[model samples]
Target chain A: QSVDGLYEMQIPTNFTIGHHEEFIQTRSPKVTIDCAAFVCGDNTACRQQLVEYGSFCVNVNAILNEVMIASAFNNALGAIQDGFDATNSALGKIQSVVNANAEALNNLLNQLSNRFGAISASLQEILTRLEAVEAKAQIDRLINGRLTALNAYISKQLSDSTLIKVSAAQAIEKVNECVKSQTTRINFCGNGNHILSLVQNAPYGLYFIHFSYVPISFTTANVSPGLCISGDRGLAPKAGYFVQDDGEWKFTGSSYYYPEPITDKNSVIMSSCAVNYTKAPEVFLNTSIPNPPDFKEELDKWFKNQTSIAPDLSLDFEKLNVTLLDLTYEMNRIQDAIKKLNES
Target chain B: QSVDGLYEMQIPTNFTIGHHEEFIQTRSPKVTIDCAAFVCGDNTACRQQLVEYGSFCVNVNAILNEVMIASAFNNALGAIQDGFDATNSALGKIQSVVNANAEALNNLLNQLSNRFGAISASLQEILTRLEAVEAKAQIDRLINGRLTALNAYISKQLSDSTLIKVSAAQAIEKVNECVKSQTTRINFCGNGNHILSLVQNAPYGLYFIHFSYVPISFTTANVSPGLCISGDRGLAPKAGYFVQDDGEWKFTGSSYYYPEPITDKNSVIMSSCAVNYTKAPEVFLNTSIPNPPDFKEELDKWFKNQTSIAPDLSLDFEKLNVTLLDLTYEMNRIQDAIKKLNES
Candidate 1:
């Protein structure tokens, strides 16, 4: 039979079609063999054929099964890709929106910075003033007492002198002249603008002063004239002059003076020179009063007025503390917001 | 004898001044004396005189010594006060400056906050987008397979049906009508706006078609039809149609059918509609072609395309991942700043 027609044969009921071609065909063009007789004589031959046919049928079925399985597998894979593509598209849309929102947030932050900058500047200014006050207070305490003592001793020496014999008017003029001459000599020798002593109500008082002279040099001869006096009174007076050139002081004269008699016991010559000299010395003298004794008193009273002031220095220090606390707190709040955004 | 001139006899130094009348020839007022015998010796004559005059001198000297010591103590106390005041003032100045610097630091912190605030917002936007994408992806994966498969199956069944045959010219109209009629019936019985099978480039070759339709209400025997057909295919389709109650499928009937059938094989006929009148049927079908005879060759081509597509998906996913990582880092930085502020 032709190969195409052979496929039309009805499978026999008793005979088995083995995976190989030999058993299923009972007769061929070359042989007229009774293949069924081999199976009939022994049960083993029949069983073998049946097993072979069953196995062959199963293998064919498996081929068909695999086709369906493969199709299903491919279909599933296609579906997954479709889903992933859709997901990716959605993600892209979301990313665009995110970028826009981020831009908005950046704008808001810029506005916030501008707002806080002004407040910071104001806080800084207040702190500067408080620092200046504290520094000036320190310098005052250092030299106030010494300046006061020097001024008092100088005043007493002028009161008792041989100049007391001159008429009150003449005496006053002479005294004025002497003081002016002495001051000029001292200024020239010391190369200082003026003689400075601790004084009350001077500009930023209790500070160093510069006295200027023509040559602007301090020597023993020039400074001696200013140091000489004709008096011995309350304390054994030691007259000394010191030159401070650019804040460094060099002692120029140190001497003692003995008191001179005015001669006539009943004579009370109130010299005009003495009066004039008193006024002439007033400028330097006025500067010589130690930082007002009332400064401490005033401060104490001010502290007393404040209900919250405590005895401890720590409490006082707190009063002077700057207002940085609030700024720091605000910064912290911003940082937290940033943190939360990152986490999300 | 007068008090001043009447010392006619020498009085003993040992005598007590308290016995004033006996010590002096003339009774004179005097101070009381308490002295040791060596000083106001045991000799009666010496005691009387010593007590009268020497005791006075000793008392004055003792008073003077006490005054001097008290003055010295006062001076020491003043010196200490002065030193302490100076130190206090210096410390005050330092405290002021420290406070100012702290304020400045706080201002910087505020600026930082503003800076980070923008970053936080940007990060949050990105995070929001990412999360949205993730959700959309999940939904897409869930529905893509069922929809794709159902659509393909419906399209094949519609094309193979013989009910779409009629006269050569009329057959085209009839086939179009049959397809439209069946689709309309399916839509009226299925879920709201549900899609069924669809075709593209028909008669030339069958491709997938997506059909969308709205279900009719079951309240009355007269069903209202609402249906539409889409033209495009694949994951993104453009074709759509909506049914009108004016005894017509409206736009689809007029637009989709050609003037006549282009091929002799094309025919049109009407038959009874095989609509599943059940609860909201998923009317979609899968009309995708089965594996070709040369299956291995086709599979290799498909797999290669899939592999190429996968990297694109991965690249997009990686971009998203990098954005997320940057956001996380920024958030941590913000958190640290907040922590530092709190500590301060």
Candidate 2:
């Protein structure tokens, strides 16, 4: 079937003939148009009026089909498409940028994880070392306490020896002084005239009577004098024996006049005095004291006493020796423990 | 200078309008036209050429004139600005999305850090607990060893007491058997039966002598009696005779029998017999013996050899007490250490 239409057709109209008025009235009544042709067509017949109407329709249609309107529409459509394309392109760019940033953040997180892991491991090592150090310090303190006790014991031993020597020297000096004093007293009273005069004149002469019958002046004047000493004499004299010989008798004595008597009071006193002197010297001479209380025993006792004052010093040295040996072994064991810790 | 003259000015044409053959022949030709005529003619000519060009350009030029090319250009330029604004809007949307994702990632990292920190702290706690457990295990082992030694000592003491009682009973049995044998032998021999005849006629003669006179008979009887009686009695006949018939045999018949005439011999022989039997019993009784000859002394020695071993035993007990006390103190110290660790 052949389709017959307006193929490659063009229509021309006189728009100056008031066609705008008819088209506005027909298409949009609200649109206002003023032209001279419709106003000037007052005398036209019905046939002419129809022809004018046709012409107005054709002219209005042609105006709607103008090239400028079509072009404006095409440009508007193109602009919308451009806006859509631009928005899509910008979104793609933004998404790429965001993705790159996220990748960088992920890399930073991984690096942080590795760094933190290393820090954690380092902290663990530090803690392990600190524990070992603490244990070592404790063991060291134990060892040091034991050593201090040992040193104290040794020092006490030396002090005890010195103290014993001082005590012995003091005892010997006191004994010697007693013997010398006794000998000096005996020699002073051995003068026969002095003793006889004293015994004959003194009011306390009865106190010397025990020695008066021993012949105060029987041999030479200076032979055997009865004792008239006051201090520690243990004897009494008769009442007439008390005499004061300050300057009344002037007699010169010689060794021949005082020839050795058979029984002299000074000799008996000298013998007794010799016994006292010998007693003082006996201690110095006798070295055979059984199991002498020596420095070690004294030191042991001293240590026992000081244990309360210095409790750490109460460590028994014999026990300490064993403990030290054990400590050495324990130290070695601790070293091994440290080595494992390090290895781990 | 009239305005009409300006409009009437003459213009020259560089090319002539002609038929195709003439146009090819004359490439450049000049034409002179009247001013008014040329003006009018150029207008008509331009109209005709524009119509031939088609309506697209006509409409394009019309819109271009109505807006002005500059304004259209401005509008086109503004399209790009609009595109930029749209792009920024799209970027803002993307930024929001990125911010949400970044915040989520940051939270995850924080959680991971805290979780790992907790895990590390837990590991440290476990390590500390493990150390405590190990120390406790060591102490427990030491305690068990001490307890074992104590049990052994107690058992040894009980066994020693039992052996002493058994030895006393065995000694009495030996004396009675000797007395019975001596009485029987003296009665048999004193009735004028010959010694050899008595030996031959005795019910359990040689076998009795062998069993009774064995050097280690006491130990053998205490252990196992079967193996000790295989020896001949001739080598030790005197001992055999005394062991079998006590020491009361006589050539003439008489009822004379010593209760224990061979007391010295019995002691010597029985001591020899009991040597092996007394090994463990001796050690239990005299508890100062070293077990392995050189190492630490045995527990038995502590009781039996009190003079030599009591002090050492006391010291060991003291040391053990000290160690246990120290262990308890250390446990408290470790607990404190753990508390400090937790606070940290």
Candidate 3:
């Protein structure tokens, strides 16, 4: 609700999702993140995460358990190609970047070591020259031999400082460059190439691939295709789910969760047959969605008894479907025949 | 923060996302849509979602009962391809739209009259008629004039005559340019394709034949690639796992969550070793974080050996990782492959 120009939203303190947006700007010094209705925090509704996130076992090998394992292989190929030599580059580029990053870090220590060594050398040299005023070497409190020479000496010692930093940067570029790269595997649902191509928020929320929560939008269909987002998309607390251990989130077990299901769980579907049980007598005390008396009645009218279209096959399909509606209730000969539908 | 002159502003939410700004005007009384802190319900985190949904079974083949049954071969292809004519094209497309969306719903009603036979007829005429309305429809409304008019019209009419909602739209397309369609199979996870291609956020939350709850990021490398996905994606509650009854989730028990699940429960792995033991004293304790080891012994040496490269992988890839850390563990293995990596 908005009053004047202000929109107000109130939420529970225990709201698991603590996010808020103030489009214009600030007045409050403190920022608060919170949720209201979205947190279906009962007991079982919230505890499954889908990020780089699990473990288990009485030796843990449940396929159901692994459905939550998430991974993306950069293939050492980082940004250059999505092209050739660089064709499949990012994963490898990342690989080199990885190696170079380490090299640069290793060299940083050496660079620091060198600077410290020089600093020690310069200080020692200064110390020796100043040993003049007793072993109590004070560069300034001394006499003769141009005592103020400490300025020039200090300047010289610090001169190589920039060099150390610069070289540290160079060593960090330790890379294989383009070298080789792998293209995304075709037909494999296992690679970034596919993830890379999702049409986030495509018109109708119908990208050949799309994010499920951000509703289908026809208005902004022209917007840039979005990237697969990664962050806390509401994983919750549970025995086998996520839990905080020490300072980190520890897992006893892990799984995925959806707070607001895609389709409302309460969506109601219509009954398929015309027969209504509430209005009937219990003959044979039969129970199952009561099948209509003449299963062929409705179909006969629409199907026009025109079996020529896909005839024999179509009848079998319809009867089988009816059989299922009233499960375990003895089948009519037609129902029995439909069940026997073979390749024929 | 934005500076007084140009649009120069940066930080916090990131500036590179520097979006081009535009301002416009419209005639409306209330302005609504705001979030930041409230998205979090007064916090700084949590809020995003994605998933294919599911249910069904011990129940039965909702589809076998539902399938070939409602199939539309375009009258075109009856045997070939499920094939032939343009016969099954539109129906297959529509069938898909049906099954996935409705099963726990046909194989669900082939998935409802399979609902829109009238919808099919009505949409074509309306689309052929209206333009100002949009993916919208404003059908005729009168008790006597061909109560044959679109029910959407009556809904719109009855709704509006009550001086009811002037701010809504009523659109109901009724036909298909492509007329033929295919049907469904029984006991299936369900989808025509939109559900098939739902972003899962997919799969990583993407369902590529992948476990749907798992994500695609690789930070938690300990996570193994798992598989709970079945058939086509788009099945929900949990993808590849739902069917409806009286309208409730039901599982007929699908198959294979992981292809290589360590236990059928699903799992991740580092390296497989053959040594066996249930209890221990010094099967050799190791740690990754540095310490005060023998300067902590094997743990220290293991962590120290963790230097050279593939650093991230080595850190938590299990213990051999630290031993294999600097690649010297092998030499240690040969030297004492028989030290009996001992309780000593």
Candidate 4:
């Protein structure tokens, strides 16, 4: 608690050479370096021993400047614990704020990715609905194609001025005219109910299957409409005709009746003697005319999605990206400035 | 490197030209694209553009497929990132697997976020040491603060529940039934036969200055305990009842027989405490409120520190929003799912 002002500094003296050496108290102008002598007089052990003065500066300065430094720096050693802790406050910010920000960025990325995912799924949904729409498309192709072919044939026959554009009221006249041109399209039928009973066996399903003979072929063979027999007196047209009970020699009886005119209903199918025949095979290419009321619908959805929704997803991400980029930029600037504060 | 085969896709010519309008010819009808155009083409630029092209193809495929795709895709990306380390290998459930699943759908959107970081480093030391905390806050602000305020008040005071709780307590006691009293407070003494010795020239330590004075009222204005003049009849209603010889009182005693309480307690004074009342503000935050017995040891260290420890200072620190509405829900699932994986 009390200090001796006599000494330049305070120290526990045991380690001092002066403490151990015998001194002949006398007046000398200068102190001598006894250490350089051959036979040492004082015999005091010096700390200059390499082991004591190891690589680290464990010499006079260490003793004086450090340990002896105002009785050694408990100041630095002690102050450090708190200094570093106070400094570590910034390191803590890395945890609280920096970490929080990173998490936010991650969430944005994750959520944005989802938007893309959802749109992709939506795109797929659109593609499938489109398939069904196309299915409806081929049917239109099939019907339209055949209709055009029919109209072309009729026009050919009407090479001269014909009632091609005739009114619905003149149907009787056109009906008689339609009868003059009957073209048998080589069609086939199976063994089931058909428009014309020219042939009947077990029929396959789609129309032409019931068009010509039993075990009908794929598409194309044909006969006439109800122009064949169902067996009533051989369907009233057997090669053998019998006299009626009331007539003796009449040429027209149940088996033979006056020929009647056929209807020119453009859509009706006629077979037997009512139409002509084409003896060649006619194979048609599967037409792919993309048309359907539903095509318009499906296409509309896909377009809006691609044209609007899909693009919007991109823009949404773009906006998110820009924001994120700016965040990174700002964070970097702060990081740089903080690096400065930290380094110092 | 050689291409597997010649093909039929077109690419740019110069940096951006459709590698100038060209066609493909090969031994195989369907070969890979042929790239033969300008010799003057920027070679380095070509590499860069190609790489850009390569990156784009990868991106598109990723989008239509990755970096994008069905939540079925969620399986590949999330499971992959995880399984690879945790589940990433599962993305081994690559496009093929995910696609087989996309045969399923996009659950991918619902989860997979939180790949961020966050943690707090607000030292636990501050909280408790702060006890009711902020008490510690302003403690510094004040002590470090009113430290001068103290040298102002010559040291510090009388800390406060603010002169607040004190009056209130006494008031309640009185209001309740207590001329409600305050007994002169039993104070005891020590075993030293002490006295003034009347050497009033220059006194002894602790102050060596003024121990007594006018205007100095102890704790409460009260009648003095050991008050006296050097000797007034050595007063006791005048030692009148004295009977000389061996100095005994007449009839009974020389002094009144009022056995007085001895004023033997210690703890005489404290002030600006004298020395320097801010003539330079020997402004010190006199520390030492150690306790818990260990407080001695702790305060022992704290002093080296409080004396050395107290930092001696402060005044420092001083998208959607992609309307991703389902974020909370989605993020939760991802958070929960990822937790299972991370913790394990």
Candidate 4 reaches a DockQ of 0.00
Interface RMSD (Å) of model 3? 56.5
Candidate 4 deviant stretches above 4 angstroms: A1-74, A148-344, B1-344
TM-score of chain A of each: 0.21, 0.31, 0.15, 0.25
lDDT of 2 by residue, B1-344 (tens): 01111111111111111110000010111122121121122334223322322222222223222226545645644554565455545545655666676576657655665756665565566456446544433333332233233333323333333333333333333333221122123212122111111111122111111001001111110111111123321111122222222223211111112223333333222212221333443424342522333223433333234231111111122212111112344344435544543433
DockQ list for all candidates: 0.01, 0.01, 0.01, 0.00
lDDT of 4 by residue, B1-344 (tens): 11121312211111100001111111111111111111112334223323322122221122211102343334333433332231222223232332433332223222321111100111222223223222322222222221122122210111111122233333332222111111111110000110000111211111010000011111211112112223321122132221212322222111112222222221122221122224554757464532234445534532423121222122221131211222344344445544444333
Q: Tens digits of per-residue lDDT for model 4 on A160-276? A: 112112222232332232223322211111221113322112221111112222222211111111121232211111111111223221212111132222222211111221112
- What shift in Å separates residue B59 of candidate 3 from its native position after superposition? 89
| Span of ten consecutive residues with least summed lDDT in model 2 chain A | A271-280
Candidate 3 local lDDT, B1-344, one digit each (tens): 00111211111110010011111111112211111111112221111100000111101122112213224222212322231212224324434433443343234345324323433443343333323222111111111111112122222322222221111110000000000101111211121100011111211111111001111111111111122233322222222222322323232222212112123222222232222248766755352532322334534433424222211211221211111123243334334422322212
The prediction achieving the highest TM-score against the true structure is: 2
Per-residue alpha-carbon lDDT of model 1 for A1-344, expressed as tens digits? 00001011111112221111111111112212122232233456344433332222232233323325445434533443343344334435444554544454445445555544543453344345445434433332222222222222222222211122222333233234332443322212122222322211323211222233222222221111011113411101012222223333232222211122222221111111111110011111011111122222333332322122212211223334335223344445545544443443
| TM-scores computed on chain B for all candidates | 0.23, 0.31, 0.10, 0.13
TM-score of each: 0.16, 0.22, 0.11, 0.16
lDDT of 1 at A125: 49
lDDT score, candidate 2, position A104: 60
Interface RMSD of candidate 1? 58.9
Error of 1 at A234 (Å): 99
Better of 2 and 3 by lDDT: 2
